[PDB]
Amino acid sequence: AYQGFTKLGNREPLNDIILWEQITPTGHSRKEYTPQASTEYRVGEVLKADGTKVQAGEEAQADSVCIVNFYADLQLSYHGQLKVVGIHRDAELKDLLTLEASVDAAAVKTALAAKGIDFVPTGL
């Protein structure tokens, strides 16, 4: 190509965070959120109770961890569904959280630990 190099992008992260969850007929451990306008979601993000991402100063309000990849322009998840999904209780997750700038990871972990969510150390 002109200037040689061409790039086609990287692969999006896959949904493999879950190690153990309370399997039940009604999906006891999962909750669904309506996606906010002009926002993009990816696996490993922390959502507030209203579906908006947790920012600095409100770590105590952390509610759930994102589980799907969502595209703003399409308004459609990578699996062709209309709503975002997040785990909010009774689960064990890989320690691969993604947090906004200046968000205290320890505070978020403590807030989520109250709801029965535990994080397993992850290797390099």
Partner: protein, 352 residues
Amino acid sequence: MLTNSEKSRFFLADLTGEVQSIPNTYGYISNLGLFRSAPITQTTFLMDLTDWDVSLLDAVDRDSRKAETSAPERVRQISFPMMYFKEVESITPDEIQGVRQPGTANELTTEAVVRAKKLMKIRTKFDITREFLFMQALKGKVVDARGTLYADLYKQFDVEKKTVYFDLDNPNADIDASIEELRMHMEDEAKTGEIHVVVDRVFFSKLVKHPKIRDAYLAQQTPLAWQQGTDGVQAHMNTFYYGGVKFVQYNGKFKDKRGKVHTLVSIDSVAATVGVGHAFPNVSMLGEANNIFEVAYGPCPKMGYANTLGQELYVFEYEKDRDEGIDFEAHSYMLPYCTRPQLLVDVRADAK
């Protein structure tokens, strides 16, 4: 079969079978079989749109050797999402221990009977949902029973919708003109190398009350003429044929979990008192060549079905550990659509 009397432990009485009662299950659209199944191996599918135009030739002289040519083709692509349905059931010994089945005096209930009953109920529910979704797809908008919108064919294919107004309440109104308008629109906009209109009760009554149509209507009342269809509930549904268009009265209706009643034949934001109907062409006889109506099916999230062909309905069974009961599950991943949305026309019995 003998059983204890109603007021004495020592005198017997003769029992008779049970009197079943089942809710109405309208299936007119599904019975026609004009929707072709098309299983898919993943959660999303695509399609290609093609079209070309032709024009008359011009007579050129033999010796000049002048010739003509034609314009090239054009292509386009589309995408579609899909809808997921699921419900759960369970069976435990407490429902089988010492429970006389209704139809017998002494015979005890067993696991097989309960399993069959629950499976039949689930299948009936899924069939009712299928019929509702098929009607919604025919309306031109695939809207979930709770109001969510999944597809808008008119915007998808870049085409508007036509509506034909019948002034049935006006004695001087013209019906032939409206029928011809509908027919000519359908013919012109088909764009390809038998018209049915599903009509409401009020609309049908207004149409058949008109003075200019009683002469034709009364001549068709002979039973020999009618025989020249059933919705699954009524074995003889009103039908009226005029001007090459067949009018059918469909009274199907269903109830939501909230008690809200959904009438199959209706137009959004229109009073029920106003006659309403939907028109579409009949394509069922084309069979394998039917490319106008199709239904897609996808796999379920289960481990053993990640990348397999879709199915009409999945059923799974699991134990509850320590033999305390059994669990059932039902899955479906379906989306109906029409590839010729311009052929769907609304019909109203009110002036402009």
